[PDB]
Design a protein around this ligand. Sequence first.
Ligand SMILES: c1ccc(Cn2cnc3ncccc32)cc1
Ligand SMILES: c1ccc(Cn2cnc3ncccc32)cc1
Ligand SMILES: c1ccc(Cn2cnc3ncccc32)cc1
Ligand SMILES: c1ccc(Cn2cnc3ncccc32)cc1
Ligand SMILES: c1ccc(Cn2cnc3ncccc32)cc1
Ligand SMILES: c1ccc(Cn2cnc3ncccc32)cc1
Lengths: 159, 159, 159, 159, 159, 159
Amino acid sequence: QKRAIYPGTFDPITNGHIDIVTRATQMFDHVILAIAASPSKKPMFTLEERVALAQQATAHLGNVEVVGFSDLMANFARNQHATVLIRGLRAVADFEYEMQLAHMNRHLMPELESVFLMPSKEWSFISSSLVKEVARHQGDVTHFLPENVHQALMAKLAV
Amino acid sequence: QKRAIYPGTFDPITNGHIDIVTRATQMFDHVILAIAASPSKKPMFTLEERVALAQQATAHLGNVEVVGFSDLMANFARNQHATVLIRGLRAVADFEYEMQLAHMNRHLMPELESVFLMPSKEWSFISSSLVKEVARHQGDVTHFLPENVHQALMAKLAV
Amino acid sequence: QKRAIYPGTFDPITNGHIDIVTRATQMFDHVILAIAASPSKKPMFTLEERVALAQQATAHLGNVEVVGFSDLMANFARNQHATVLIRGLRAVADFEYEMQLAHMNRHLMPELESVFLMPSKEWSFISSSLVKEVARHQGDVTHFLPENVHQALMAKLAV
Amino acid sequence: QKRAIYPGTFDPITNGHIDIVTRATQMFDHVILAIAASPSKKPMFTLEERVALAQQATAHLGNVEVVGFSDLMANFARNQHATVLIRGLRAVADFEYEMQLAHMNRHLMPELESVFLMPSKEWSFISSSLVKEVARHQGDVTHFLPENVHQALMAKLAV
Amino acid sequence: QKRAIYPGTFDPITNGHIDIVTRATQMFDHVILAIAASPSKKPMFTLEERVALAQQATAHLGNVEVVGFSDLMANFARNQHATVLIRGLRAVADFEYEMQLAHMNRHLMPELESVFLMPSKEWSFISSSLVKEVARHQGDVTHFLPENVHQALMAKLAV
Amino acid sequence: QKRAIYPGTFDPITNGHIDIVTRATQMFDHVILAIAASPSKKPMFTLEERVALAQQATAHLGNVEVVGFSDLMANFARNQHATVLIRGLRAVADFEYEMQLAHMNRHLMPELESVFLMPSKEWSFISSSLVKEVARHQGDVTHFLPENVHQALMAKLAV
Ligand SMILES: c1ccc(Cn2cnc3ncccc32)cc1
Ligand SMILES: c1ccc(Cn2cnc3ncccc32)cc1
Ligand SMILES: c1ccc(Cn2cnc3ncccc32)cc1
Ligand SMILES: c1ccc(Cn2cnc3ncccc32)cc1
Ligand SMILES: c1ccc(Cn2cnc3ncccc32)cc1
Ligand SMILES: c1ccc(Cn2cnc3ncccc32)cc1
């Protein structure tokens, strides 16, 4: 069984993230979608909310397991028996941070291979930050989010 | 009459911004310089201050109208009857965010065309953030700002 | 009454070029789609072929005029009384050359303003170069080309 | 039971290529190291030489198969029943072309997924092109090549 | 005597910074390692702590002088009689800000030459921010920091 | 007593090259402006012409020595007892190649340190390649070249 971890903040999980995790399940036997607590990022949704949103948004994928973590991601990968670490690669500015993170993860866990997947052109220009910014200004974001996530984001912004 | 909107935070408006809006007035019949409230950016100047500074700095341009907005920029463009959205293109890191914003604006208002203009080499390495940083350290920023803006920034930093 | 030029080699014209010129026709009164006559790289299609293909592919656009040129693009723009130079922006790599080109064009003809337009996400990762390479190597490129161009390309590759 | 292809010109195969293919063998059951037969740029080593060098340099990797191909890389991947396309990512400049290539490969063969692997920091700033240029100009490239490749390159440059 | 200044936040000083300052001492007669107060960056270590850490980490280099400053860096360079300003160049995103800062420093002090040095491949993917992030999650950062700095960072994070 | 080399093809030498070499003469005792003898791309000007043009264009700089070389740039630097390798940095695209070159140069000659200098904003968007292309296509390039170079280029293009 090949086990992969897909770590991130997922605040909230978007269609771009669903695209990446779907591609990951077609390649690896079991995919752990790992949601980092990320308090330094001051996330809009609590970790508990982000885990529930991602569980509902990925329920149609049989080999996905959603978990939350506050640990060092290399230790969390070791502890999940993962040998692959998935990250989505969108644009140039993303790539620079991704290489730093992957070279650091390789220093911490050399047998964990970081692999990058490319999203559909459809989701190549969106991010959780951009979708939240549009939603804060009451713009329509239905196209970019799973149904349950769109509902939660609308509810969150209605106080 | 071709109507263009030039939206931004303009905290404060610099000579780089004047360069872009001047190029825009030579191309389009009416240019709306639209100042976003941008509270998430914690701006140095209030929206009212930024609007007054830009009005004074662009008074020599007959087809410029300065307005403030807190709305979604695509809705503000529709409501101003604008069919062109101008953004200045300075460097690579700017370009990435610009493509995300323009593809999002196109999703929200397909008939609004985002156009990018390139500033003079003179203003190609400055930004409102960089000018404020130098000014905070008492460095001379007279070369980068309209006279009224330089005065307001000096006064702001003198408590 | 704005006159704009949209120069290039168009070897062959793709749906990405059709997207950019269509956007340009929505904002300027007259658009000259200018085909470079003697490119340094020996083109797949002769100038006669490139002009005929572009004419047929843009025939539905009332305010487009397809013209061949052999001079420096600024010299032709000046002779055509164009005040706007349309450039399509796809990704970071093109942007670097575009800055060099636009600053050089501003030195050569200051009265010509470069305007950067963004193509649909659909054509943001293609080029005439990539299309030709794929087609020469027996790949399906139908989706990226106007029908008349697809027919001419199949004919060229058959012989 | 995943079948992966790792295509390229490998002119000659370097330690950077050995690093990427080794990583690919740790995560996929079968890896085809696919050597492009007729590259547009006349290669330093003939296809026969490139295949023999890659075979000897990967002989210790039980699940690697070295094969030459002359078709479009997607057509070969389809015929080989590969569902994974390995690409090595070194720096920003390659990433731009990689995005264009991967979106084109997804259009040609949607059932083939591109996976991006990161080489060691040791090989992150090299290429077959730079190695050849340095060696042709009497520079030491021993560190960047498998021993058999170093021996063949010295022989080629002597005559 | 050629005098160079190497300014930065150094929160904390890493092996990447030691690499750059060592290269600088091999090139220039006297190197001032200048630690900016940087309150806007909300640094982990006080200026006094950062100066003591850097003094201890560079004690083996005879021509290095460590100082703290809150002044405009161009004025601090003039006041240190420096004619060279060193900055390390790691990646693309770093380069953009570096060109803005150097063109601003040139406007403020034209006789001060900004020079960029490239770190070892070993430190090309690390930063003070990344090392602090790993350390906050209890990951091993001994490889990236001088011994005294590693001890201080472990102590800082143990409350 | 620092000896620095500033290598390149200088085909022809431009004001951008004059800017970089002038900056290098202000910080190092002796600067060798090193002209590559047999570039892979057949140069517009022969080596004799390139050396004569660079000599006349730098004659006012007392500590510059113009020399032709045909070996690998590191082999020449070693033979000249240079410990500093001057490289001009214009934009992001060049930076990527510069990193590869500098890490390769450090592998070949560790005692040679690469130093990156930044040209004036005035020359930050030009290259010998762009200048030649513009001039060949009947564009005005007088502003970008030393007078002697402008005279030689007009003569070369006339015949
Ligand atoms: C995505 C990105 C970062 C995090 C924070 N973080 C956790 N472990 C880490 N290891 C190295 C660097 C950052 C780390 C979480 C999700
Ligand atoms: C410049 C940039 C951003 C803003 C904030 N903002 C407002 N409407 C928006 N629509 C999409 C994304 C951001 C938006 C304002 C000025
Ligand atoms: C498309 C491709 C190439 C050309 C050649 N060309 C014409 N004017 C130019 N100015 C600067 C550089 C190249 C130029 C034209 C169109
Ligand atoms: C390495 C180098 C070049 C090739 C030529 N080539 C094959 N399929 C392709 N698809 C798109 C573009 C080029 C392609 C193959 C391997
Ligand atoms: C590194 C980077 C920035 C600082 C803050 N700072 C101080 N003087 C400055 N001059 C121009 C711009 C920023 C400045 C400090 C260290
Ligand atoms: C300018 C342009 C090209 C050269 C050719 N060349 C010489 N040493 C080299 N090392 C690595 C790569 C190319 C090299 C030299 C100067």
